[PDB]
Design a protein around this ligand. Structure first.
Ligand code: FAD
Ligand code: FAD
Lengths: 607, 607
């Protein structure tokens, strides 16, 4: 069929057999959504993704968007706009939207499992469809008058953008210089140039676009604390009826030529530089921009991580389907017999190693993002984990840089195995894996680079958190370890947990010693990404082992057929991951315990 | 001007580390002195940075176009202009035998010259491999064929190596292309080959020599049944070289690839269009796979050198960017939002990234130059004291490291180069995303990584009775045993050497056990690629530490200015690599000692 190979079976296994999200379906906020309906929804969007959404995956890359300087707009290929219409006509741009905005209430864990299919089939389509979800964030942060506009925006299906980055302010958001000047009538004129804005124009997909723009009010202080957030629509509109009016002064000036994700128009966006003002409205009529915008950034980070996992998963399943059919070579037990029967390449040890590496990381990463999503609803976290609202929020905050940072790095790296499995044919555009790789490279960059994820994770989600979220997670791992068929896995998991605990202690030592020896802090920066990755590997190993424990129970109860094969695969993946990935964490701990500042003291001219 | 060269590091290796200048001016190199060698390096580096690199982008953005009715390819004009610059300077005859018009030189100098073309526009070197392939044909040919080879080299004919078929890629012995003997002693070749690099090349050359593997009718199966045939694109006058009637060998497709787009990669039909593909049996003997491996060995050396050349220019591009990009405050002032902004080389993670890129690019450069010092009997005797037989076995041992470890390592570390640019790294405006796409092929053609690692263990270690490996290990041991300023590095290397020796013993143990239980051989297959990569890391760490020892001597003697910075960087790279890369080999050794056949016994349905 299409390039996109979905895995609803593994999602449902996670949601129901492992995490128990069906326990909240039919109760309270989710009163009107039962387990059967959730399963039917996953299967339906999976078919939508495999069908009309994936249909234009190739076309969007080979026939990419075009910037028109005559009109300061972008044109999109027709096949991709047809996919977008299939998304909208199904109501899938309102997934997890609040009920009062027209949404269907559902757990976030189910919401992200549905979105995974769009991100695997054509991820730019989800990104253009994030409008209603950003209208809800504007709603939540807006005044009572502004809530009227956000309602109109969600119901009319307007596109939306998040507008932070500038040529000199990317990782350092607080260096932004885009200015806001208050007008007599209480509106603001926004002046500046922003860069790398996703969906900054989107052809004729929508009747309006809501730009959510960070800018510095005249006279405000420096840094992120001086930034405010503004509602800047593409077109002015009647604040009561929604009728579209005159063009507002916010114009795309260029579309970037990118390695991949080409059908997502990434634009330079000029505010008030083309002869008419860019009118903006202060969100919430309060000056609190970076806090307001981080509601958007957290959702973007969850999306990027789920996108990376979705893409590895279809890369893996493409590579597996190819390997089952490709005949090449004799069995290794007959390698000296030049007349031995030829075999399919799943018989070769390096190919099985490659495939099990792909499988274990794809399924480990799916479990991580779904686990993370179970802390995103207070009700779900209470029902399935027994944790209250405050702890759930901190655990979610701890896990987000894992989903994003560890997810984005891992998926791109393991797609290398997916392509390798095809041999020379993996280098061809005829197969989708090389586009997967190119489309995935961006995941380690936007919504914050990997280094910024790792820094947030250690400084903010652990040190500032006083270790409460991390201690909670480590305690759940310890409980699994303490508890026969998984004795070896639990022993390897205990070594990996202690390794992560040693890393956290060394890094905390380097940070605390910085009070008296300032340069000590550099060793924290030197170790931070390796630490983030180690925690991801530990979490992957633990959740796979938990899945294997469930699979053992289902096999013992008499699973047969396709169920039995699925469950046997979980036991094999958990055991492979514990024996081949986890032990490397011991060497990484010892490396982190011996970090020094030599590389920091070296003259720049010696590189 | 994407290409950034590093002649200084090449000369450091050639003259200060390995002493290749000891043979310059003596014996085979009596008319090439060290001053001339250095001038050639500067000359081709300048040509590479200018006219060759000039069409690097053009070749990818405006790629070759196939006419299926003429069976020819059109190359973009800028790329052919770059090719003519290469020809006009004699750079398709680097290292060519003197009697064919070449300049005699050590292979180590020859590959250092070629590195620049491969960094600037690697497909240009690949199109220019004709005269080197003519020399192989000369070496394997009859007296009469030697006359044709001389013509082809003098006239600069292009050439191809023609092995692969849809069903015979890694399993070369499965090829079905046929050879039908004619009464006059020529052969008619009949079949369809695929993925053939340069099988047409527009009007670059007046002829192409296709070197084609085919199975004489009635010959046995496997590679042993194959013969090698000289199959010219055009018939020609065997006395004068005058081009004659078109021979029956026609391109019937050109692949759409992830990268290396300007290298036409062709389906090649022999005897399918009503015109015989006349072939001449090479050397008039039936010995095809052994003759073709002369070609395959040069191709594997080229691919490895290509990967390293590309990582080197990716690193230097990233370093130059990081030197100029201002972003964020120093980590010692991260809480102070009025602190001065700093260039990103001040950040710990960026220094970690850049030193990771530096150490791997420079360790890899040392590996291929080290390898090349064993490719001439006279160099191996003069610089290492080893006789010709051992030199050949050591070169044989190191080739899969150059190819397999070079290709895997360069692609993976270019991820760090791209990351250093931030979001800009995802733009086609900078060359790193094309470096990545162009590099992905390196783990696939001239034999996949898995085939490299299987060759490395079974043929270059086991069949060699360990003699080459024992020689290399003994040199590493001698370095470790010999200032105490590299004490920590030598301890770390001693651990890494014992780790690699332990890996080799475990895998050898599994092979011995397969005498009793055939399936034990699968453990060799499971561990073979990780073993090959471990030996690569070990060699990188040792050779960098050797470079550091030389650099310490040069600093002690009183180096100043740019020299001093260069040498300081060598010490820092060797120390960083020993402390951050080498220790992981301990965990990999433990992982290899515990491999099992669970993943081989798993039902294929469970994946
Ligand atoms: C850009 C490009 C240019 C090329 N140029 C040329 C050229 O000029 N001349 C030429 O002759 N060929 C050329 N090739 C062919 C190239 O060498 C083959 O692609 C390569 O040898 C792999 O063969 P295959 O593609 O059929 O993959 P396969 O052999 O089908 O391999 C598929 C997968 O199975 C694995 N596998 C296969 N057999 C084994 C085994 N016994 N044990 C373990 N794992 C195994 C592989 O490692 C890989 O992961 C080119 C290919 C490309 C992509
Ligand atoms: C495809 C794409 C879409 C995008 N879409 C949007 C969008 O819709 N909205 C939006 O606002 N932005 C968007 N961006 C911008 C994106 O978030 C930035 O590219 C990203 O935050 C990195 O900033 P930069 O590109 O300026 O890199 P830089 O900040 O210049 O980073 C360069 C390098 O320095 C490192 N570095 C920087 N600061 C530090 C530090 N303090 N400590 C350690 N290392 C550091 C980085 O990790 C990186 O390796 C998009 C970018 C891309 C590529």
């Amino acid at each position: 069929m299409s390039h996109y190979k979905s895995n609803v079976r593994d999602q449902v296994f996670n949601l129901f057999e492992v995490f128990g999200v069906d326990k909240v379906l039919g109760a309270d906020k989710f009163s009107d959504l039962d387990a059967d309906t959730a399963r039917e929804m996953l299967t339906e969007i999976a078919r939508l993704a495999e069908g009309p959404i994936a249909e234009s995956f190739v076309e969007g890359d080979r026939n990419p968007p075009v910037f028109d300087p005559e009109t300061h707009t972008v044109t999109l290929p027709e096949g991709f706009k047809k996919s977008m219409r299939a998304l909208f006509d199904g109501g899938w741009d309102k997934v997890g939207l609040a009920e009062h905005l027209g949404g269907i209430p559902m757990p976030r864990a189910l919401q992200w499992a549905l979105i995974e299919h769009i991100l695997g089939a054509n991820p730019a389509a989800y990104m253009y469809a994030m409008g209603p979800g950003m209208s809800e964030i504007f709603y939540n942060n807006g005044t009572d008058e502004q809530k009227k506009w956000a309602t109109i925006a969600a119901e009319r299906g307007w596109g939306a953008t998040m507008v932070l980055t500038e040529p000199d302010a990317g990782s350092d958001v607080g260096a932004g210089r885009t200015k806001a000047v208050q007008q007599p009538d209480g509106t603001w004129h926004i002046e500046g140039v922003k860069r790398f804005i996703t969906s900054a124009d989107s052809d004729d997909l929508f009747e309006n676009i809501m730009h959510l723009v960070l800018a510095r009010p005249e006279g405000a202080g420096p840094g992120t604390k001086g930034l405010s957030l503004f509602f800047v629509p593409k077109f002015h509109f009647d604040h009561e009826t929604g009728e579209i009016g005159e063009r507002n002064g916010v114009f795309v000036t260029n579309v970037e030529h990118k390695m991949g994700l080409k059908v997502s128009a990434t634009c330079e966006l000029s505010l008030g530089q083309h002869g008419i003002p860019a009118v903006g409205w202060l969100v919430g009529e309060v000056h609190n921009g970076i806090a307001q915008m981080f509601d958007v950034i957290e959702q973007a980070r969850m999306m990027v991580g789920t996108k990376a996992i979705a893409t590895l998963s279809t890369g893996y399943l493409n590579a597996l389907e190819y390997a089952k059919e490709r005949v090449q070579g004799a069995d290794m037990t007959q390698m000296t017999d030049k007349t031995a029967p030829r075999v399919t390449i799943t018989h070769h040890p390096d190919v099985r190693r490659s495939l099990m590496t792909q499988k274990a990381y794809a399924e480990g990463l799916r479990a991580i993002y779904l686990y993370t999503a179970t802390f995103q609803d207070a009700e779900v976290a209470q029902a399935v984990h027994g944790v209250d609202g405050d702890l759930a929020a901190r655990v979610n905050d701890l896990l987000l840089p894992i989903v994003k940072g560890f997810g984005s790095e891992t998926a791109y790296a393991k797609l290398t195995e997916s392509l390798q499995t095809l041999g020379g044919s993996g280098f061809l555009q005829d197969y989708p894996i090389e586009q997967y790789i190119r489309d995935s490279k961006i995941d380690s960059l936007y919504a914050g680079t990997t280094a910024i994820q790792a820094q947030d994770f250690f400084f903010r989600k652990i040190i500032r958190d006083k270790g409460q979220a991390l201690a909670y997670v480590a305690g759940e791992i310890e409980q699994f370890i303490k508890n026969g068929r998984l004795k070896t896995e639990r022993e390897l998991l205990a070594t990996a947990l202690a390794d992560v605990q040693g890393m956290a202690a060394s890094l905390t030592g380097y940070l605390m010693a910085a009070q008296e020896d300032a340069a000590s802090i550099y060793k924290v920066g030197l170790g931070s990404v390796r630490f983030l990755m180690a925690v991801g590997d530990l979490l992957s190993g633990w959740l796979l082992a938990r899945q294997a424990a469930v699979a053992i129970e289902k096999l013992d109860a008499g699973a047969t057929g396709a169920d039995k094969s699925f469950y046997e695969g979980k036991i094999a993946a958990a055991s492979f991951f514990a024996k081949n990935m986890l032990p490397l964490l011991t060497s990484t701990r010892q490396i982190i315990e011996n970090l020094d500042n030599d590389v920091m003291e070296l003259d720049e001219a010696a590189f």
